[PDB]
Amino acid sequence: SGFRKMAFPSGKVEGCMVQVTCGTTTLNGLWLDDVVYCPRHVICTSEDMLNPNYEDLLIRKSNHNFLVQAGNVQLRVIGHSMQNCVLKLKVDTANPKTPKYKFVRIQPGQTFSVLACYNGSPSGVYQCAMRPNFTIKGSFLNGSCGSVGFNIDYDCVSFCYMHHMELPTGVHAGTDLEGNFYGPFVDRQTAQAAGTDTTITVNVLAWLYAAVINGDRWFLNRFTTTLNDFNLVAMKYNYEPLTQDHVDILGPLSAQTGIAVLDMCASLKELLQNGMNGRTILGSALLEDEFTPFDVVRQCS
Amino acid sequence: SGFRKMAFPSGKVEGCMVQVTCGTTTLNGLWLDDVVYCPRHVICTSEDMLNPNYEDLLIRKSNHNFLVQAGNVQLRVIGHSMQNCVLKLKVDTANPKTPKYKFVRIQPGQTFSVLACYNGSPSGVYQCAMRPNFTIKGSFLNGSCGSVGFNIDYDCVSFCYMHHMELPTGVHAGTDLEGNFYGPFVDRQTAQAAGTDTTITVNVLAWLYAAVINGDRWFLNRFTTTLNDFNLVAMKYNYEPLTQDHVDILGPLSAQTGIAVLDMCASLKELLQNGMNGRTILGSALLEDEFTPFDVVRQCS
Numbered sequence: 001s002g003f004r005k006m007a008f009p010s011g012k013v014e015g016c017m018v019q020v021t022c023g024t025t026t027l028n029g030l031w032l033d034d035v036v037y038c039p040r041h042v043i044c045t046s047e048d049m050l051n052p053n054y055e056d057l058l059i060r061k062s063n064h065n066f067l068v069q070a071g072n073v074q075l076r077v078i079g080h081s082m083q084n085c086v087l088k089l090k091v092d093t094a095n096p097k098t099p100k101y102k103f104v105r106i107q108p109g110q111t112f113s114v115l116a117c118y119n120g121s122p123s124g125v126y127q128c129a130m131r132p133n134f135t136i137k138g139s140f141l142n143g144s145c146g147s148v149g150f151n152i153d154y155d156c157v158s159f160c161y162m163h164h165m166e167l168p169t170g171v172h173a174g175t176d177l178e179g180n181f182y183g184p185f186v187d188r189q190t191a192q193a194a195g196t197d198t199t200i201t202v203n204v205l206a207w208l209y210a211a212v213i214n215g216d217r218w219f220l221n222r223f224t225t226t227l228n229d230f231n232l233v234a235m236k237y238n239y240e241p242l243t244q245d246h247v248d249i250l251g252p253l254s255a256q257t258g259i260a261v262l263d264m265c266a267s268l269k270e271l272l273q274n275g276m277n278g279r280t281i282l283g284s285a286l287l288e289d290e291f292t293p294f295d296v297v298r299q300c301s
Numbered sequence: 302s303g304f305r306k307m308a309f310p311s312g313k314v315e316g317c318m319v320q321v322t323c324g325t326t327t328l329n330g331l332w333l334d335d336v337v338y339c340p341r342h343v344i345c346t347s348e349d350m351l352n353p354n355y356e357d358l359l360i361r362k363s364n365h366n367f368l369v370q371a372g373n374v375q376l377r378v379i380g381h382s383m384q385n386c387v388l389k390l391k392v393d394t395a396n397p398k399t400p401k402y403k404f405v406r407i408q409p410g411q412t413f414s415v416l417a418c419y420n421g422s423p424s425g426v427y428q429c430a431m432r433p434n435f436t437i438k439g440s441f442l443n444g445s446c447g448s449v450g451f452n453i454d455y456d457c458v459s460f461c462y463m464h465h466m467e468l469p470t471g472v473h474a475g476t477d478l479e480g481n482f483y484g485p486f487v488d489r490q491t492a493q494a495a496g497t498d499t500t501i502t503v504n505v506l507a508w509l510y511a512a513v514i515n516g517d518r519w520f521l522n523r524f525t526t527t528l529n530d531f532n533l534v535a536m537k538y539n540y541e542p543l544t545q546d547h548v549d550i551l552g553p554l555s556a557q558t559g560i561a562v563l564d565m566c567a568s569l570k571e572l573l574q575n576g577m578n579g580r581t582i583l584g585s586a587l588l589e590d591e592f593t594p595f596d597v598v599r600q601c602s
């Protein structure tokens with residue numbers, strides 16, 4: 001037993017991280033087969049970062065402008081192109097460590113593991129949720145751009161995030177692996193703010209089921225609510241509406257614990273209205289919303 | 302910026318995990334050079350688990366009693382021995398993926414990454430602290446034994462934990478890689494309880510420094526206390542005494558923030574006496590004690 005925020009094992013992605021240097025800017029790239037993927041702002045300078053015209057900047061580059069280091073071995077760049085906000089560098093060597101993989105664009109509320117890297121060298125692994133406002137609450141310093149987020153599904157790595165920037169509130173923004181930002185953000189050093197966020201209701205309910213499976217039961221009650229009455233409470237406390245799709249997704253956890261979804265909603269309602277009164281749930285004094293139903297099932301059996 | 306509970310990248314350890322099966326019992330083993338390390342209770346049966354005599358059980362085994370699977374490839378066992386609570390199985394094939402490594406026995410309060418595995422197959426990675434009562438708060442199901450805990454120090458893996466069992470409070474117990482339990486525990490299915498735990502004071506202070514580095518300052522105050530006055534507060538709230546060694550270890554964080562250690566102690570004293578009053582620190586409504594000073598420095602720069 002026990003319930004912990006858990007990342008996927010990172011080895012399959014570690015074997016794909018390289019260093020990309022263009023001028024005085026160095027960040028990370030993702031080496032899959034004979035292509036390296038990295039944020040296109042590697043081709044900016046200090047003065048371009050206000051509002052760069054990236055098509056102009058790339059027309060002015062040649063293959064020799066791009067230094068790609070895979071460990072100690074230098075990879076020779078034989079081609080370059082731009083797709084949305086990602087640069088694709090064709091190299092003469094196919095990565096022998098390329099896992100089975102796919103590129104996925106995730107929905108808000110879904111989680112993924114981040115392999116934080118600097119200078120092409122992985123430094124740590126942690127779990128993130130895509131917030132409803134399309135930011136993530138990560139841990140990224142200068143040089144971390146090009147670090148990727150992923151899930152693993154039977155030795156197939158699904159890449160879903162590449163890191164590009166930090167917002168003024170300290171949260172983080174980036175793209176799918178085709179270079180499309182999550183959210184309304186753009187890759188220039190300007191005044192961009194995260195919109196107001198909301199709490200991921202279906203994940204909170206999943207985490208309450210994790211708590212029951214692990215023996216935390218003090219928040220349960222005999223009452224059951226209706227979906228409409230519950231959603232009126234959710235809106236008052238800045239929680240996302242609960243849909244019937246979410247109810248169905250919580251099916252297996254409801255059946256394993258014998259607690260109907262709308263029964264667990266009545267517990268959540270009372271936790272929101274009355275708080276915890278000095279008690280904790282799975283070691284937390286706040287309601288946690290960064291565990292999906294899949295995350296709970298994967299860990300709780 | 303940002304501060305997250307972060308594990309070490311797990312690839313170097315993933316390449317070392319194998320499956321060990323003895324009879325109807327299967328757990329995980331650690332394959333380094335031509336030796337596999339695993340918990341010795343793999344040689345028990347259902348009825349032995351009450352109070353087994355392990356030297357008798359091992360004298361009755363032969364090499365062919367041990368099935369060792371490295372992925373699909375079966376490793377042939379050419380020798381077996383017992384060291385404290387670990388079994389060592391000599392195999393005919395040296396692991397080509399053996400990292401640079403060492404075995405370390407850690408002190409309470411230190412942290413490490415756990416690579417949870419089932420059937421020799423890694424499933425997740427997360428961070429743990431060795432509690433003062435020599436348990437860890439992990440996430441382990443049946444079949445997880447032999448999963449290891451480790452730190453990485455410039456591509457050298459220091460192994461410090463091998464998992465053996467779960468206690469009745471839901472916390473976890475195991476050994477160093479030489480087979481010596483952390484704490485007073487023994488590897489049989491009996492009535493063992495974790496002793497009363499305490500909070501790791503030096504880690505809480507490190508985490509308050511992480512919070513300041515990341516812009517959380519609301520808990521600071523002008524006051525400074527003495528080490529003796531602070532330790533009187535620590536004892537009242539079941540915190541470990543703060544030593545001058547801990548003060549020195551917090552030196553670099555004190556210098557980076559300009560906040561003297563005894564100044565931060567006065568903030569901790571007020572947080573303990575008055576609580577948070579609905580505010581949070583680094584996203585937490587409780588004081589966190591599973592980040593070492595090294596963990597904070599590694600992430601905060």
Ligand SMILES: *[C@H](O)[C@H](C[C@@H]1CCNC1=O)NC(=O)[C@H](CC(C)C)NC(=O)OCc1cccc(Cl)c1
Pocket residue numbers: 027041044049140141142143144145146164165166167172186187188189302
């Ligand atoms: C790429 O490595 C970097 C990641 C940032 C650096 C600090 N935390 C991060 O996540 N991204 C940028 O520097 C980005 C480049 C623009 C052109 C998209 N700009 C940016 O994040 O500016 C905000 C910022 C906040 C704090 C510190 C810095 Cl250096 C930058």
Ligand SMILES: *[C@H](O)[C@H](C[C@@H]1CCNC1=O)NC(=O)[C@H](CC(C)C)NC(=O)OCc1cccc(Cl)c1
Pocket residue numbers: 001328342345350441442443444445446447465466467468473487488489490
């Ligand atoms: C080894 O895989 C297993 C790990 C346990 C299983 C449940 N969580 C864990 O961490 N260890 C044992 O089963 C151990 C064997 C003895 C001989 C040391 N006994 C044990 O943990 O018993 C306690 C227990 C609690 C909950 C569930 C189970 Cl199956 C066992």
Ligand SMILES: [Mg+2]
Pocket residue numbers: 220221222223224262263264266267
């Ligand atoms: Mg109820």
Ligand SMILES: [Mg+2]
Pocket residue numbers: 521522523524525563564565567568
């Ligand atoms: Mg002070």
